């Protein structure tokens, strides 16, 4: 019942209830004549919502907000982008125009600036060192160290045991490394181990793209990263 590319018109968003007061959002985007799904997180914060990641661009992001307004009907007051690439910050202006406070680490803000990407307004302090964790309302934010990118964060919802790995975690179907231009291949397995050691109790693991699963997505990503490392 998890939405895939074939059930999502490009420009539309679906929401998927993972657990109580936790949803993934699913959008699609064309890239290089391919069509990819993309996940984000929505977490109930009392009477308001915390959004994790944009829906990969302004049009998708406006559809996401409209879809939240329709299906949940609670206001999105804050949003966190998990790394500086366009699939996570693309649409930050749309959120901002709708009165959402947008957040990212100084690391992510710096890299987005350098990249010429949209720049979330507010800064998340205390994530600069590997293994750093900080509370952000109904979630914990964790910097495991460099993986898909030097700045990538993961999000844990303690109340629901939902780990959102963002693009540092691959779904099981993805058997080869994705787009690794900005990755730290050498540090990626160690960063996944930090996630393993810090959240052994996670029941649900949501990858940045594709199907959710359990904690084996961590070991899976390790396996894939290592196979890529050994390309010859």
Ligand X SMILES: Fc1ccc(CSCCn2c(-c3ccccc3)n[nH]c2=S)cc1
Q: Please give the annotated binding residues for Zn(2+), written as ranges.
A: 83, 85, 87, 122, 148, 167, 209, 220
Options 87, 132, 151, 152, the catalytic residue:
87
Give the x-and-dash track for 42-61 against ligand X (CB under 6 A).
--------------------
- Residue 207 CA to residue 154 CA, distance in Å, equals 10
Residue among 96, 183, 88, 191 nearest 143 (CA)? 191
CA angle at 150 for the pair 96 and 31, rounded to the nearest 5°: 65
Q: Which does 31 bind (CB under 5 to 8 A by kind): Zn ion, ligand X, none?
A: ligand X
Residue 220 interacts with ligand X (CB under 6 A): yes or no: no
Q: Retrieve residue 215's tokens.
A: 């904690």
Task: Give yes or no for residue 118 binding ligand X (CB under 6 A).
Answer: no
Q: 176: which 2 tokens?
A: 């080869």
| Residue 101 touches which of Zn ion, ligand X, none (Cβ within 5-8 Å per kind) | Zn ion
Among Zn ion, ligand X, none, partner that 36 touches (CB below 5 to 8 angstroms by kind): ligand X
- What is the distance, to the nearest Å, from the Cα of residue 67 to the centroid of all Cα atoms in its chain? 18
User: Does 36 interact with ligand X (rule: CB under 6 A)?
Assistant: yes
For residue 90, the minimal CB distance to ligand X (Å) is: 7
CB 76 within 8 Å of CB 69: no
Binding residues: 83, 85, 87, 122, 148, 167, 209, 220
| Residue positions counted in the chain | 232
Burial 187-224 (b: 16+ CB within 10 A, else e): bbbebbebbeebbeebebbbbbbbbbbebebbebbbeb
Choose, from 25, 45, 85, 152, the residue flagged as catalytic. Answer: 85
- Residue 209 interacts with ligand X (CB under 6 A): yes or no: yes
- Smallest distance from the beta carbon of 230 to Zn ion, in angstroms? 22
Question: Can residue 138 be called a binding residue for ligand X (CB under 6 A)?
Answer: no
User: Could you confirm whether 25 is annotated as catalytic?
Assistant: no
- Binds ligand X by CB under 6 A, chosen from 139, 167, 206, 218: 167
Active site residues: 83, 85, 87, 148, 179
Question: Which residues of this chain interact with ligand X, rule CB under 6 A?
Answer: 31, 36, 85-87, 167, 174, 178-179, 208-209
């Amino acid at each position: 019942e998890y939405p895939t590319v074939s059930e999502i018109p490009v420009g539309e968003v679906r929401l998927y209830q993972i657990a109580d007061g936790v949803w993934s959002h699913i959008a699609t985007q064309s890239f290089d004549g391919a069509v990819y799904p993309s996940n984000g997180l929505i977490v109930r914060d009392g009477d308001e919502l915390l959004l994790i990641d944009t829906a990969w661009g302004a049009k998708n992001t406006a559809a996401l907000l409209a879809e939240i307004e329709k299906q949940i009907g609670l206001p999105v007051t804050r949003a966190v982008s998990t790394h500086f690439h366009d699939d996570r910050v693309g649409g930050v202006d749309v959120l901002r125009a709708a009165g959402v406070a947008t957040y990212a680490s100084p690391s992510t803000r710096r890299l987005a600036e350098v990249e010429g990407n949209e720049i979330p307004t507010h800064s998340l302090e205390g994530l600069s060192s590997s293994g750093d964790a900080v509370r952000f309302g109904p979630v914990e934010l964790f910097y495991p160290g460099a993986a898909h990118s030097t700045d990538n964060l993961v999000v844990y919802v303690p109340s629901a045991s939902v780990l959102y790995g963002g693009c540092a975690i691959y779904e099981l179907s993805r058997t080869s490394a994705g787009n690794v231009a900005d990755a730290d291949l050498a540090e990626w397995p160690t960063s996944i181990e930090r996630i393993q050691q810090h959240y052994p109790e996670a029941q649900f693991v949501i990858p940045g793209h594709g199907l959710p699963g359990g904690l084996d997505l961590l070991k899976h990503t390790t396996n894939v990263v290592k196979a890529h490392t050994n390309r010859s």
